[PDB]
Write a protein that binds this ligand. Sequence first.
Ligand SMILES: CC(=O)NC[C@H]1CC[N@H+](Cc2cc(Oc3cnc(N4CC[NH+](CC[C@@H](C)C(=O)[O-])CC4)nc3)nc(-c3cc(Cl)cc(Cl)c3)c2)CC1
Ligand SMILES: *[C@@H]1O[C@H](CO)[C@@H](O)[C@H](O)[C@H]1NC(C)=O
Ligand SMILES: [Ca+2]
Ligand SMILES: [Ca+2]
Ligand SMILES: [Ca+2]
Ligand SMILES: [Cl-]
Ligand code: NA
Ligand code: NA
Ligand code: NA
Ligand code: NA
Length: 471
Amino acid sequence: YQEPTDPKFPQQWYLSGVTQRDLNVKAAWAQGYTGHGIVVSILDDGIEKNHPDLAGNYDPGASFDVNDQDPDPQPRYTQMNDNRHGTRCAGEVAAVANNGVCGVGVAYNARIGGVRMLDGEVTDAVEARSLGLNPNHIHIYSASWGPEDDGKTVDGPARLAEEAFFRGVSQGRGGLGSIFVWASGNGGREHDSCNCDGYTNSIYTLSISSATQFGNVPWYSEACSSTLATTYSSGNQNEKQIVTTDLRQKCTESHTGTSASAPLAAGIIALTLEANKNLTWRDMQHLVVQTSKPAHLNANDWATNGVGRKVSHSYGYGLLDAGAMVALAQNWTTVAPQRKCIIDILTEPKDIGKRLEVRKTVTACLGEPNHITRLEHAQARLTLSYNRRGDLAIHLVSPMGTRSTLLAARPHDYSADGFNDWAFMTTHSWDEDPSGEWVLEIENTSEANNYGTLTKFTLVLYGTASGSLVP
Ligand SMILES: CC(=O)NC[C@H]1CC[N@H+](Cc2cc(Oc3cnc(N4CC[NH+](CC[C@@H](C)C(=O)[O-])CC4)nc3)nc(-c3cc(Cl)cc(Cl)c3)c2)CC1
Ligand SMILES: *[C@@H]1O[C@H](CO)[C@@H](O)[C@H](O)[C@H]1NC(C)=O
Ligand SMILES: [Ca+2]
Ligand SMILES: [Ca+2]
Ligand SMILES: [Ca+2]
Ligand SMILES: [Cl-]
Ligand code: NA
Ligand code: NA
Ligand code: NA
Ligand code: NA
């Protein structure tokens, strides 16, 4: 295998590292996987389709302009270079290799497009028309943004966008399901808690957080239980950043944030789909769970779950490992059809006060076609009132003892509107047997005499009843 000759490839430390602090992408390339035949679309502020490092891989069939309602996603050029982010992300996935320009994409032979959707009012329809763009041509969608990362917002896809997610994973990609890759958020300095973002909190999105070059949790990271894995991104000013294509036919060495991590994951997923084009949207999440690597990622919350995997709310199952992903994809057996077990927990509303614990022993739909012995995602769908929402911290403990943080305290969240059937999601009990006692904890983290009521707690289990590995 001959590694890329591009002038800035040596500066793409998260690929070309010889120190083991990288995404192990060269190993995938050396197995023959470069993204050939795979189609990725960047949902953002547009894509400079004539960029010298993107033109050779540019695919109009992966592109649209929902802001101006035309097929051409070219960015709006301004003095401050406002609409450059989509172009930066496109190059992370699929910048051309061995052409004397900038560096390379993770999947440097994949086809790449962009949806111009963020340069205008982002409505439910705009979101739905973007997520649902050409779903039998585009394999993988990359989205780096969502509701405001101000640490006080609770919002997610409205009706059309949620319908687009279910249509995508159900009928997209020939029935195998669109793969939606999401950044878990940039709200770290606002103490944001990312299950409050219904896009990254969705089971239908494969959610990605960031690690700095030295293996630390960056200032901008949000912790939450819905995150699945991690890719490198920026950190302090002694740590390197992401190197990629930039607006006006330039390169950049200063692409940053969790919003730079999701495209790298999308590229790794593109290599993996080249290795096995029959992978379903759920198969891809299984591969990520099984192959991601905690080693050398620093966090104070690494915990071993019930099947022996380390999980963190900052990192999910750890750093993506592209060589391992493509190796395991090749002979992967398609997972069984997805089951869903609905358990309405409360017999009466419960006063929260200073602290509430709800314990329930469940059989996970024993005797039914939705019996689950092998969990994938789990949700605690909660309806509650509270006088100051951000004073609440919420945890969910599985029968195997895995304590998922569903919500951390959010000091800026002064809302008195509570949670209205909010489906807090955790990935940390993946492959556990969910039969047994679940424990929900709601606590007032403030010394204030806060008050409210939990009126509904639905435990929703997804998964299967076959195919488990030895822990
Ligand atoms: C009841 C109803 O009908 N309820 C409609 C709302 C439902 C909730 N939704 C949330 C939402 C807001 C949002 O709002 C924005 C707007 N704009 C940005 N931008 C633009 C500026 N950019 C500058 C970057 C520069 C500084 C740089 O390069 O650093 C940052 C990102 N981000 C988020 N997006 C998304 C979204 C983003 C992507 Cl990607 C894909 C999809 Cl599907 C949805 C979603 C808004 C409409
Ligand atoms: C894809 O997987 C399905 C489900 O196991 C199987 O029926 C089908 O034959 C597979 N197709 C290919 C081309 O491998
Ligand atoms: Ca246009
Ligand atoms: Ca190049
Ligand atoms: Ca957030
Ligand atoms: Cl469902
Ligand atoms: Na965000
Ligand atoms: Na997700
Ligand atoms: Na444990
Ligand atoms: Na059990």
